[PDB]
A paper describes a structure:
Protein tyrosine phosphatase 1B (PTP1B) plays important roles in cellular homeostasis and is a highly validated therapeutic target for multiple human ailments, including diabetes, obesity and breast cancer. However, much remains to be learned about how conformational changes may convey information through the structure of PTP1B to enable allosteric regulation by ligands or functional responses to mutations.
Moreover, the space group of our data set is P43212, which is rare for PTP1B. Thus, the structure we report here is the first of apo PTP1B in this new crystal form. The next part of our analysis focuses on specific regions with backbone movements between the two chains, based on the Cα–Cα distance after superposition. Interestingly, we observe that the residues with the largest differences across the two chains generally correspond to regions previously annotated as being allosteric, including loop 16 of the L16 allosteric site, the N-terminus adjacent to the L16 site, and the C-terminus including the allosteric α7 helix.
Numbering used by the authors: 1 to 284
The structure:
């Protein structure tokens, strides 16, 4: 596998940091004027992580249309993703409104609500079956139906109800619960099993709206998920899989949301996930 030879050379030369900084230097920049409006200040978790105007998701209800979320539409791979920040206490209703309006089936979460005693994300879904959540601002109800706690991740079934129409929909919550407090997982095996489970559910298929992916900023861990899924699609689709250049794919994704992949170790981890996944899907 050509990508494996490249990985070995980068590892042997200790070049991960230099390659990562090259990506940062080459990354696109586009305006984010809506995100910077004063009325949206309290809708952004981090002042330096904003959606581009050209790719931002717009809310559809009769009120401010702004959410810190971006549509990443990968043309060659024929995949779309919504990457969003971890919801804030005051944006949980907006988050579920987005899920509803975009017709998503799956939400992918790659962090814990609290990590090393610091808040990373609001508790935007119910922890107990008998304590459903009502979002009065966007007129939505959310109930935990079932939970499957596995060794390295959890899959939940939720019921999201539009209280204005009484229509209900099933949402699958894919929660990777064991990403280390510092650095990346040592092996990508559980991350790949997680990705495969998301794929099998139909949450990434064209028959639904885009999967909604978040971490805390919605760019680092989130980026690894989208980058790995897209590169695996390209390797399986292209006539010559040795042409897949993860760096080029990442630069393409960064045209739709800034900052995807936030460290050199996340970059290395993405390559490692794509290599191991391709060995299983395509042959070793
Ligand atoms: Mg109970």
């Amino acid at each position: 596998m050509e990508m494996e030879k490249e990985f070995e050379q980068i590892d042997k030369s200790g070049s991960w940091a230099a390659i990562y900084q090259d990506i940062r230097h080459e990354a696109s920049d586009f305006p984010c004027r809506v995100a910077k409006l004063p009325k949206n200040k309290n809708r952004n978790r981090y002042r330096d992580v904003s959606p581009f105007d050209h790719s931002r998701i717009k809310l559809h209800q009769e009120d401010n249309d702004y959410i810190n979320a971006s549509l990443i539409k990968m043309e060659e791979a024929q995949r779309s993703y919504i990457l969003t920040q971890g919801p804030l206490p005051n944006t949980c209703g907006h988050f579920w409104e987005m899920v509803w309006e975009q017709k998503s089936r799956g939400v992918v979460m790659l962090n814990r609500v609290m990590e090393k005693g610091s808040l990373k994300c609001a508790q935007y879904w119910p922890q107990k079956e008998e304590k459903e959540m009502i979002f009065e601002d966007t007129n939505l109800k959310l109930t935990l139906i079932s939970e499957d706690i596995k060794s390295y991740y959890t899959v939940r079934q939720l019921e999201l109800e539009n209280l204005t129409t009484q229509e209900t929909r099933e949402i699958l919550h894919f929660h990777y619960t064991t990403w280390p407090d510092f650095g990346v997982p040592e092996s990508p095996a559980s991350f790949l099993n997680f990705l495969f489970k998301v794929r099998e559910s139909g949450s990434l298929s064209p028959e639904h709206g885009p999967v909604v992916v978040h971490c805390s900023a919605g760019i680092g861990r989130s980026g690894t998920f989208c980058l790995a899924d897209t590169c695996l699609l390209l390797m399986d689709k292209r006539k010559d899989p040795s042409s897949v250049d993860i760096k080029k794919v990442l630069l393409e994704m960064r045209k739709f949301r800034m900052g995807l992949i936030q460290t050199a170790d996340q970059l290395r981890f993405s390559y490692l996930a794509v290599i191991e996944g391709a060995k299983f899907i395509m042959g070793d």
